[PDB]
Amino acid sequence: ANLRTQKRLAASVVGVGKRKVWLDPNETSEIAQANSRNAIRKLVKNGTIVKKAVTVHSKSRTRAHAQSKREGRHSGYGKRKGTREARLPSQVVWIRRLRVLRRLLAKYRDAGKIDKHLYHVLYKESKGNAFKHKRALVEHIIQAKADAQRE
Amino acid sequence: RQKTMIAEARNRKSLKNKAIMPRSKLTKSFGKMEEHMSTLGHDMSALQDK
Amino acid sequence: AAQKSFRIKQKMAKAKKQNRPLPQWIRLRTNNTIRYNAKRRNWRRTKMN
Amino acid sequence: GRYSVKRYKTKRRTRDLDLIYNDLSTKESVQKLLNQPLDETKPGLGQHYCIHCAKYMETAIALKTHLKGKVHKRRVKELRGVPYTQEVSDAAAGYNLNKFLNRVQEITQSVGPEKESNEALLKEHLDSTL
Amino acid sequence: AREITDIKQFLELTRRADVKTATVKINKKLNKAGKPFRQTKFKVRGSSSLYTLVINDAGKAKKLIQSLPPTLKVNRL
Amino acid sequence: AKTFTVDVSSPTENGVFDPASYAKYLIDHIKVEGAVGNLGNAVTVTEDGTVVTVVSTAKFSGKYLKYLTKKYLKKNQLRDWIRFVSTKTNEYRLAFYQVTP
RNA sequence: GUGAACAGCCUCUAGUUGAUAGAAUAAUGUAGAUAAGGGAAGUCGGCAAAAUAGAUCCGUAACUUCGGGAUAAGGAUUGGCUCUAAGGGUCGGCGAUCAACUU
RNA sequence: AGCUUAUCACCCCGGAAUUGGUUUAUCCGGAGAUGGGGUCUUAUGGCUGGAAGAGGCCAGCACCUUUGCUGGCUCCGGUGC
RNA sequence: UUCAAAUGAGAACUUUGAAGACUGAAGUGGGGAAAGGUUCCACGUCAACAGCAGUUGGACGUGGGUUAGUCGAUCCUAAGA
Ligand SMILES: [Zn+2]
């Protein structure tokens, strides 16, 4: 016999590929009688043709390795194979840093912790460097305000 | 017997290829479960009726 | 192709209607010289332009 | 195969930790090799010579980066105990036991802390100059 | 397809004289997250569009069913 | 709280299953905040003979219950003939496969 | 998934399992691979092969159309596991809360 | 399909050096900034209608069918060079 | 590449199942343009062809099959004729 058409039709009906669908070799004449998708559906429901659930692709190992990376492993020079820039652009780092410094100064000026003139000079100093992060900027602000009230 | 179970499941599984068929859809004989449950130590007088 | 012109499709239809063997009731005729179709065509052997 | 064949040739043979033990044992030996007059052929022109890893570096900073490394610590953790001579190899088989045991107690008493103090002086000398 | 809020315009649509068919749909829904209740959708088939009215309260819904005209065909579920 | 309800009539009648051993397995192998031995006022496993019942205030799920029950069936060599299924929400039951003569 | 990466290696979905077969394992070949000690004595000719190779750090000459040469050259390292520090956002008149991989 | 929603752009008030606002990238302002309020394009997203009645996932039950019919679920989120 | 069964006079090569592998999303996948023109699909089916074989086939014999106000041509003009 030749159940090629039947395998094709069963795949097209169930909505999978032919690599999945399964024909019990005992009901060969009953399958060969079928030449229609309605008959193939009958054979699907009665239990003559089934679906063959998916071949697995587990991610336990990937999740474990990722967890170790979060914990700070597998990162040394023997694992690094691209440049520091290709791994993380200095442009991206500088963008983050400068957005942060601009946002902080905006919030301080709007709250009233600082005036617009000191805001203006700090804006351009943070556009340049000499403010490496939030901590340094806050400390410089404190020094400025303290010497101002001292004057 | 534990080693025998492992050796049996090694042949039975073949899991990295083709995703073992579900038992929902398959059908088994009667006589097979007779032997299985007799080996387990049950009796089939309640199943023979059926 | 698949966006043919009707001229090409008409020629194709003629070719399909020609693509046959010879009928058997012509073998049985008085003074029959014809034994096969010598103008037979197949898509793979000869192209019809 | 090729890796072992082309690393561990007798041409490219290194300096047999027994001798490094015997060299780090005494004061004069370590001071001689720290001094090491200017030789035109040696890599670092003499100076910058690690004794544990019997190796000439080019410069002081190359010595620093060598010492801040696991290749150095491999050797220092290999050189702490006794040096495994033929005495050990035959005392294991039942041959000149008393010589081996005298050598062992000799190292445990005399030569051990001698070399340890020499290593400590070496380390603080190098860390202070570098 | 179009939604309606008012009731007067739904009655006008039922009496528009180009409507032949309507249908009532019942759905079980949860309010906010909380309690089951019975939403009703009264759809009427115009020529160009399908107009629909959403009624949450079944009491007003069945009175709407009563006030529907009699010649209009209706389909339940 | 949350209630889950297993039925064991089918196998127990034909004599392959005892609900008391199943509950004795569950009550010890159920985990809370780590390992065995923390079912303090949180969980209550109780049988009737035809129906086993679980009541949990802690983290517990039908998939966890199915996992435990399948483990018990594999222990007693019943995985290849019986399946744990849901008939209604949080109402499960054991059922034989489609064995025909 | 590894990794800078649509590279190379493995896998999921989908597809294929097509290319005349069987038995032995001689030489000569075709495609590869290893070899003591010596290391270009080979050969027209170091042809071919080998060696080097990624990333971090140090360091980098003559000459120069001053822009380059330059990855010049030459050197120290690279695993795994347990930790430390630093690098942010949202709300509250310093705290509560949340989150990523980079060093 | 209905309602709503945006960067740029524009309008009203007001009149700026102790010059200010501001992009990752430095440009804008008496030819009227910052600030306050408002208008517009509706690509794009959100809600509703379409539309759950569909589809999907399960459980069954007729077993004599070359179509046999019922029941449940289909929810709420999070994150990024 | 292999194992059993089925079919058949006959199976290393066909069908199903059971295994083992491969392409490895810049595919041995899913769709299209030019070109081809029924090679698509089904039923029978082995004389010749498929550099072995053949129960199989893009072969042989006979049929079926391509549904548009919204996809295209059609219309516009481009270099040009
Ligand atoms: Zn050393």
CSV table of C-alpha atoms and ligand atoms in Angstrom, one decimal, chain D residues 50-54 66 71-72 75, ligand 1:
chain,number,residue,atom,x,y,z
D,50,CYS,CA,62.5,35.8,39.4
D,51,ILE,CA,64.1,32.9,41.3
D,52,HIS,CA,61.0,30.8,42.1
D,53,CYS,CA,60.0,30.9,38.4
D,54,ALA,CA,63.6,30.9,37.2
D,66,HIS,CA,54.5,38.4,37.1
D,71,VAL,CA,52.0,31.4,37.4
D,72,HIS,CA,54.1,32.7,40.3
D,75,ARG,CA,55.5,27.7,41.9
J,1,ZN,ZN,58.2,33.3,39.5
